Structure formats: C-alpha cells, structure tokens
Ligand binder design. Structure first.
Ligand SMILES: CCCCCCCCCCCCCCCCCC(=O)O
Ligand SMILES: CCCCCCCCCCCCCCCCCC(=O)O
Ligand SMILES: [Cl-]
Ligand SMILES: [Cl-]
Lengths: 182, 182
C-alpha cells in the first residue's frame, strides 16, 4: 500500500511526461503497477487526485528552480527560470494548469500551501519595490505579475500568432518587469 | 452562396452552445440539411470552418475595442473591453486560442491580417508611450502587453489558485498598465 501508493505517483508522472495529462488511464496505470484497477481507487479518489500528487512534485521542482538589493532583477531571474521550466518540462508544466483545481472549490492544505510558498518568492522583492503597499495590495500585485509572465510564456511557447516570438521570450519578460515600480 | 454562409452561422451557434470541441461535420450537415461532403466542398476541414468563425470573433473584438493624449488609459479601456468579451462570449473567446494555429505552420493571409489589424489598436498608444522605439520594438511590446493581459484574464476567469480574483481583474489590469512607460 505504501509502496503501491508511491509507485502509482511515479508511474502517473512518467505517463504525463510521455504523452500528457489527457493520456492518463486507470487500466494502463494498474497494468504498469501490476495491481487491480480498483487498487488505484483505494489510494486516490480519482485520476484528478493522482494528478494533484504529480503537481505536488512539479511544484517542488519549480521551487528548487526559483530558490536581494536588486528586486526587479530578482523578479526577472525568477521569471526566466519559470520560462526555462515550461520549456524543459512542457507536459508536467501544462498539468499544473489543466488539472481540475479552483479557488471556488476545496483546496487541500498541502496543495494550497505549496502554491502559497511559491508566491512568497515573488512577494519578497515586490515588498522592496512597493514599500508602502499592504499585504492585500502585495498579494494582488503578485497574482498580476505572475499571471502576466504566464501569459507571455503560454502564448510564446504555444507559437500562437498573438504571442512573443520564441527567441524574444527572455528579452520581453525583462523589458516588462524592469518597468515595475520604476 | 447560401449554404457556405449557413454553415458558418451554424458553426458559430454550435461553438456558442457547446464549445469548439463539440463541433462535428455530421451534426452541422444535419442542421444545414446537406450531406457531410457539402461541408468539405466549402471548407477543406473543420479547422478551416473554425477559422471562419474566429474571423467573426475578431470582428466582434474590433468593434468592442474601437468604441467611444491619455495612451495608458486607452490601453486600460481596451483591456477592460477584452475582459468583458472573454466573460460575455467565453466559448467563442476560447476557440481563438484552442484552434490549431501556429506561427511555424501555414497561417492563412486573411486570418493573420485580421489579427494584425486588432494589434494595430494596441500599437498606436504604445507608439505615444514609447516614442524612441522602432517598429520592431513596438511590435514586441504590443505582443508582450497583450500576452500579459491575456494571462491575467485567462487565470482569473478560470478561477485558478494562482490567478487575480474575479472581482479584482479590472483593478489589476489597471495596476499593470499604469506602470507601462515607467
Ligand atoms: C495592453 C493592451 C491589451 C488590449 C487588448 C484589446 C485590444 C484588441 C484585441 C487584441 C487581441 C486580439 C485577439 C488575439 C487572439 C489570438 C489568438 C491566437 O494567437 O491564435
Ligand atoms: C513576476 C514574477 C513571476 C515569477 C514567477 C516564478 C517564481 C515563482 C513561482 C510561481 C509558480 C506558480 C505556479 C502555479 C501553477 C499554477 C497553479 C494554478 O493556478 O493552478
Ligand atoms: Cl514534461
Ligand atoms: Cl460564446
């Protein structure tokens, strides 16, 4: 059970990496794990729940990637690591945004904490840039700038006709963030 | 002439009712009272019919953005119009980003030109804000800010745990855009 639970998370991560989030099937994972398909449902409520565990690991990788007198430079460096991550782990990266997870519904504490912890890396330099801003103001700015970088990265990496060209993604993130708070 | 236009009218109605993923040649042909082959006679594939519907969505966007020296306020107003559109026409809005369309592959000239015409509305105030920037620099900044607003709207409307809250989307679009031109 302890071994099986871990083995299923390992295999789920492997599948997402190979063929994407949409390719994950209970029959196939059970076959790879050498268990009954119902053994998957003994450890996770559904495939979405198993995907959240994979996303837990993806957050950990992102947190390692992200990690003081130049706060705009810190924001840029972190954004460049986000871009590099998205490029390096495209399918795991897309699973973070494609899994069923909403601010409306129940967010599990471990999951909500991991995401809150990533956001604190962005809020630190923003507090230096905006010394007069309160926590609500800082939280809103963190969400705005993160959402902005994600948009640049999403449209650019998808090669959409509206996005910034691939070769200019790093440069354009810099140019956007340099302007933040003068 | 009647059937080509009727197929576009019907494809738009289907996308609005059930989303891009629900679009089928068999069902469209049934509604239009034609054979499935009559669809492929007017459009190479469903992708091509989807581009025609997206063409109408661009025209909807163009009308909303054109409505009536404060270029930062113009960017904010246009961005607010983009937010409103995304909330009001969520399925047609998603079809613009979900259709198979890359800058690597063939982009039909009429389609690229229509999207470029929308971008010219953003570039005009950007040229006032950044008078020292050349055309290349302005196009990259147009792409960067569009992508930033889109990220804000996308993660906000999807109620993602990393997004700016629904009730705060307009405010954060304002707080992002006022910082442009530092
Ligand atoms: C910073 C100002 C942003 C203002 C946005 C509103 C202005 C006009 C609309 C421009 C966006 C058109 C939609 C582009 C859709 C792209 C779909 C794709 O890349 O395939
Ligand atoms: C403006 C600075 C942006 C820098 C971002 C990189 C540094 C911090 C990491 C933030 C990672 C958040 C990833 C959240 C994944 C999506 C979760 C969700 O909304 O479903
Ligand atoms: Cl991956
Ligand atoms: Cl719609």
């Amino acid at each position: 059970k302890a071994a099986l639970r871990e083995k299923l998370i390992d295999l789920a991560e492997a599948q997402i990496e190979a063929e994407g989030l949409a390719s994950l099937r209970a029959r196939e994972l059970a076959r790879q794990a050498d268990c009954a398909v119902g053994a998957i449902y003994t450890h996770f409520q559904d495939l979405n729940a198993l995907t959240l565990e994979v996303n837990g690991r993806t957050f950990a990788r992102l947190g390692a990637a992200v990690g003081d007198d130049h706060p705009n430079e810190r924001l840029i460096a972190m954004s460049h690591a986000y871009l590099a991550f998205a490029r390096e782990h495209p399918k795991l990266w897309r699973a973070l945004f494609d899994v069923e997870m909403r601010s409306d519904g129940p967010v599990p504490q471990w999951y909500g904490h991991a995401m809150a912890q990533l956001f604190s890396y962005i809020t630190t330099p923003l507090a230096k840039i905006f010394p007069e801003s309160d926590d609500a103001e800082l939280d809103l700015m963190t969400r705005t700038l993160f959402s902005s970088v994600h948009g640049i990265v999403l449209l650019g990496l998808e090669n959409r006709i509206s996005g910034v060209p691939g070769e200019q993604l790093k440069t354009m993130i810099r140019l956007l963030l340099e302007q933040v708070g003068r």
